[PDB]
Amino acid sequence: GSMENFQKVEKIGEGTYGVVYKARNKLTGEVVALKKIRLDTEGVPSTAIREISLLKELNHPNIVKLLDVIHTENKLYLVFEFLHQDLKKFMDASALTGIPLPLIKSYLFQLLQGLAFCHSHRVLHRDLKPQNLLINTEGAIKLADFGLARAFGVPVRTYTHEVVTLWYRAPEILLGCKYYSTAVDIWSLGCIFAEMVTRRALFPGDSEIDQLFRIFRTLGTPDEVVWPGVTSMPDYKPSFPKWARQDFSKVVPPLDEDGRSLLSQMLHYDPNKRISAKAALAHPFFQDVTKPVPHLRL
Amino acid sequence: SVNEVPDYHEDIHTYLREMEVKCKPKVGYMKKQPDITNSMRAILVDWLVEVGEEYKLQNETLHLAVNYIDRFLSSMSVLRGKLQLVGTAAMLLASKFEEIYPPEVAEFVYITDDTYTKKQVLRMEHLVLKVLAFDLAAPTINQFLTQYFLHQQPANCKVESLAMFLGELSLIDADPYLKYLPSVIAAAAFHLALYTVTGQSWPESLVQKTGYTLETLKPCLLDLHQTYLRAPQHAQQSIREKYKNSKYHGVSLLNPPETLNV
Numbered sequence: 001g002s003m004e005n006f007q008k009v010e011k012i013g014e015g016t017y018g019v020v021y022k023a024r025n026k027l028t029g030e031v032v033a034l035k036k037i038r039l040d041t042e043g044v045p046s047t048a049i050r051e052i053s054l055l056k057e058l059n060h061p062n063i064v065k066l067l068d069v070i071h072t073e074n075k076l077y078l079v080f081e082f083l084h085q086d087l088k089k090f091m092d093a094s095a096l097t098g099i100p101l102p103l104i105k106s107y108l109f110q111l112l113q114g115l116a117f118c119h120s121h122r123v124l125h126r127d128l129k130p131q132n133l134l135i136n137t138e139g140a141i142k143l144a145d146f147g148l149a150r151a152f153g154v155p156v157r158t159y160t161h162e163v164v165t166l167w168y169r170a171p172e173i174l175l176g177c178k179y180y181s182t183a184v185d186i187w188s189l190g191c192i193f194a195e196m197v198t199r200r201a202l203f204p205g206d207s208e209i210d211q212l213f214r215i216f217r218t219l220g221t222p223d224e225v226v227w228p229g230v231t232s233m234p235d236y237k238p239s240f241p242k243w244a245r246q247d248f249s250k251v252v253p254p255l256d257e258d259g260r261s262l263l264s265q266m267l268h269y270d271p272n273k274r275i276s277a278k279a280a281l282a283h284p285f286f287q288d289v290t291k292p293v294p295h296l297r298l
Numbered sequence: 299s300v301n302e303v304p305d306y307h308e309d310i311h312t313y314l315r316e317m318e319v320k321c322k323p324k325v326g327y328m329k330k331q332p333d334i335t336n337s338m339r340a341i342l343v344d345w346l347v348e349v350g351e352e353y354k355l356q357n358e359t360l361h362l363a364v365n366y367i368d369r370f371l372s373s374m375s376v377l378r379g380k381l382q383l384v385g386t387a388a389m390l391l392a393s394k395f396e397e398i399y400p401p402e403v404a405e406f407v408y409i410t411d412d413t414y415t416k417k418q419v420l421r422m423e424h425l426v427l428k429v430l431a432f433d434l435a436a437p438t439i440n441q442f443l444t445q446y447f448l449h450q451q452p453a454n455c456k457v458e459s460l461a462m463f464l465g466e467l468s469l470i471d472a473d474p475y476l477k478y479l480p481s482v483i484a485a486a487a488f489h490l491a492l493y494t495v496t497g498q499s500w501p502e503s504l505v506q507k508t509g510y511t512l513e514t515l516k517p518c519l520l521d522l523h524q525t526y527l528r529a530p531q532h533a534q535q536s537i538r539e540k541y542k543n544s545k546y547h548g549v550s551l552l553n554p555p556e557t558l559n560v
């Protein structure tokens with residue numbers, strides 16, 4: 001179809017995109033999210049073209065499900081499965097108690113599954129941040145908003161330099177590398193892992209240079225020993241201050257040895273050495289992973 | 299390194315092999331088109347090469363557009379005066395999918411010499427999207443070639459550029475190349491380029507990756523070899539002109555081998 005079968009319930013989100021409504025299918029009862037994409041003077045937005053084509057291909061439990069596309073003269077609606085909350089709002093609601101470890105561990109494990117699936121299907125997400133990670137009442141977490149995504153080739157070519165919300169953006173993007181790859185999404189998930197534990201952004205910069213300096217103050221200023229080729233990168237400056245690398249147990253103090261090990265591998269400077277989503281799934285941190293429902297009402 | 303995605307390369311190749319079959323145009327569609335011919339399609343694709351040149355588009359973008367066109371023409375009868383509109387809309391969509399900085403819609407109106415209005419281009423964009431059901435992430439010859447290139451010992455720019463050249467020539471002629479999958483055309487192009495430049499053949503490591511051997515590639519290779527030998531005489535010449543450029547190492551000036559000795 002569709003359209004005449006949907007009863008709009010309320011507004012639940014906004015972007016640019018973009019507005020998102022909660023709606024219900026009057027015939028089946030299914031609750032959905034309607035992402036409305038306004039059309040025209042360059043026709044259908046490339047962000048919508050990429051999101052739809054890619055999401056149509058990607059069917060996975062930890063990837064938001066695109067159910068239908070309602071494509072008409074002036075309007076484009078993407079019909080998605082509805083999820084009750086985003087991870088950012090959940091982190092905010094979890095002040096005072098924090099998020100139980102079993103839930104942080106279940107969520108990270110699921111995020112890695114969803115991401116490994118994207119990467120195995122040649123898709124970079126490129127905007128993994130808590131606001132784009134949706135949770136339901138049964139304990140699932142799913143990657144959403146693929147407007148910023150890209151289908152890549154092997155080996156990668158040069159793609160958009162933007163890219164990724166600043167706080168979650170990898171050092172290879174910040175330093176202007178000709179090429180970036182799957183490692184950029186793993187960097188973002190590393191930031192999100194730390195953020196689930198602390199409930200605050202790991203690297204909250206306000207400009208690209210401040211973002212870089214905040215990373216350097218935490219992980220040490222990278223040299224040729226930690227990251228071969230770093231000094232030759234377009235936006236590397238020999239005048240960068242040379243901060244020592246912190247005791248890694250001081251970065252996220254409540255984290256256990258296995259958690260610290262995984263976090264350190266997701267935040268490796270060198271994109272070649274940074275852990276893949278696929279390899280991370282087998283990390284000892286997940287030896288006792290379960291999938292409990294969220295401890296709070298959504 | 300990570301730029302070659304070692305942890306996902308094999309998964310991706312396997313997925314592209316599944317998708318190329320799903321994304322394949324119908325081999326016998328031109329016979330079902332009352333008003334258009336293989337020759338008209340050749341003229342169109344040659345024009346798209348020139349357009350890609352004028353706006354310095356990725357070769358990948360060109361390959362995608364041709365995929366969209368052939369799939370659209372597999373189910374939609376189009377009059378000869380409207381074929382270029384289909385082509386322009388396809389190239390617009392390919393650019394939006396693949397390019398960092400796609401040309402503006404007005405730039406696509408302009409390159410049709412004002413045969414069509416902005417309104418027509420935008421309405422065709424919508425139609426193409428509907429017919430293709432927004433399924434635009436299609437595997438191309440180039441997506442296979444770049445993987446195959448990783449098997450060179452060592453990498454040779456003439457081999458890489460020549461293989462791209464041959465893959466591009468195959469876009470022009472629906473007969474015979476509609477019957478071959480992108481992965482197969484890529485394999486024949488890579489072998490033929492490697493042989494032309496270095497004297498070497500389809501390596502055992504690529505038999506391991508693809509399951510293809512010289513025997514299974516023979517039909518396409520025989521076709522591609524003939525196309526290569528006949529390229530200077532083909533009515534359409536934009537690819538040869540394009541591949542004289544230093545960007546592609548002047549590979550169109552290399553001489554094809556007289557025999558393949560298979």
Ligand SMILES: COc1ccnc2[nH]cc(-c3ccnc(N)n3)c12
Pocket residue numbers: 012013014020033035064080081082083084085134144145146
């Ligand atoms: C605020 O967004 C939502 C809220 C609740 N359920 C949802 N289900 C899917 C969306 C969503 C929004 C934006 N992009 C994408 N791909 N998906 C969503």
Ligand SMILES: [Mg+2]
Pocket residue numbers: 328329330331332333334335
């Ligand atoms: Mg005909």
